[model samples]
Target chain A: MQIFVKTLTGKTITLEVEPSDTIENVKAKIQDKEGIPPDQQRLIFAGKQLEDGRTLSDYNIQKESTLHLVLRL
Target chain B: MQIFVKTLTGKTITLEVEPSDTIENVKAKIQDKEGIPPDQQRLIFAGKQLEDGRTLSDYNIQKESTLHLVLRLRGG
Candidate 1:
């Protein structure tokens, strides 16, 4: 599945990862790619937190789903 | 003086530029640094538009002041 990640800097980055990827894994990837710390990360999908340990399937995130990430601090 | 730019996504970037820099100049710099198209850029200072041609001094944006940017599509 393809996931689109948007940063607080208004930059949109797309990544293709497996469905089994957990939210923690996605957060780590984002931190690796954008240098944003996971602790400060707030993954917002449909205006709510993408809780840790939840899989894409758990959230009903289908192929080509986009997730907006914001760092609140 | 240093100026801070924050995006709707919540990333904060700081830049130190001359006080004479105009809003247009700042917007252009943001576009270059972040690859955000100028047309889609909405520079917000204190929750309002940072009008073009107005310098930092004009807006009284002191050192370390921060501005937020958002994009609002028309007809949406």
Candidate 2:
């Protein structure tokens, strides 16, 4: 399933990823899609901070799910 | 392949649906699994309403996606 990404800048984007994709994988995709560095991202989903080593499915992602990206300055 | 759901109540549940499953079909599963009525649920995906007529993959749904269920309530 894809994760719908929303940034504080009010821009929305979608990333294609697998269930097995990890939080790090998503950040990497965001890296290209928005030019946000992997280290600067804070992904919050299900009221939890997604850890780099965890899988998307591990956090329980569904299609059209919105993940907020808080970029580090 | 599967949808991960989070409730307003702070509980998380994983739902496995067919590749061809429609949004309407999904509500049925959620109703069965969470006891939330189909009409009362506000299914959101990709920052949009998860419509009943649309297929999951129509939006290019991946293997695991996250959907939040907000119970619809109105005060008039």
Candidate 3:
């Protein structure tokens, strides 16, 4: 349930996953709460690329969803 | 002399110009020290477009140079 993550230094972490948590365990809990480095992390949502094993219920992400962590360099 | 400006919400302004200051007067003193609004301020440096009246000695920009204020988003 409840999910609202935004990092890349913008910092805004809020998580409480379930629904069999997966998307690689929510990208390793947002790379340990934004220490970043999950393959340069790039979990953008409205800008695509949350597809690497897709699981937040296979991309149906809801339960308060708000993902937008982009740190791709 | 001494120039160090960076905005777009990153905020970091410092100026002291003189070599006949131009480049639209350092983009109007970085749009009045970052309140921004001088035609949506775009004054990038190593990324191009500081041409309009060209004068920091016509693009020789020195005096401590450091500029990067981008906020151009006219529609959506």
Candidate 4:
């Protein structure tokens, strides 16, 4: 399914992902689009901060979900 | 059902709400807990800014779902 990663600046990145994709894996995809390293990415969804070790399914992410991305630096 | 409303400051408010509750109704519940007026509360769920006239069911908010509450003034 497709999901949207929204930056603090209001830029949105569309990514095709699966429920089994790990948070770290999602960051890598973001890096490909925004060039931000995975470590520096702080992703938030469902009012919770996403962990790299967790899969999207673990968070109950729905298709076309929107995730907030804040940069660490 | 129960859901969580999380502030940007990391405080979470748990409220019992039905899927039939409107966004405004949810904001009112938040006001009851945090003293912030409903107009000043900006609620977001599923990556979309919830509209006052819309119900939780419109957003597909599940039980235990977490909605981000951003203060509209001074940045919430």
Best by DockQ: 4
Please identify model 4 stretches exceeding 4 Å from their true place: A1-73, B74-76
Stretches of model 3 off by over 4 angstroms after superposition: A1-73, B1-5, B11-41, B44-49, B52-56, B66-68
| Model 1: residues with Cα > 4 Å off, grouped in runs | B1-76
Candidate 2, position A21, lDDT: 88
- Residue-wise lDDT of candidate 4 within A1-73, one digit each (tens)? 9999887567887999998999999999998888889997778776556778889998899979998876643
Worst 10 residues of 2 chain B by lDDT: B67-76
Place model 2 in a CAPRI quality band: incorrect
Model 1 per-residue lDDT at B41: 61
> Could you tell which candidate, 3 or 4, scores higher by TM-score?
4
Candidate achieving the largest lDDT: 4
lDDT of each: 0.74, 0.74, 0.66, 0.83
Interface RMSD of each: 9.6, 9.7, 12.2, 8.9
TM-score of chain A of each: 0.89, 0.89, 0.30, 0.94
Report how far off residue A4 is in candidate 2 (Å). 20
Candidates 3 and 4, the one with greater lDDT: 4
Total backbone collisions for each predicted model: 2, 10, 3, 1
Please give me the DockQ of candidate 2 compared with the native complex.
0.03
Which of 2 and 4 is ahead in TM-score? 4
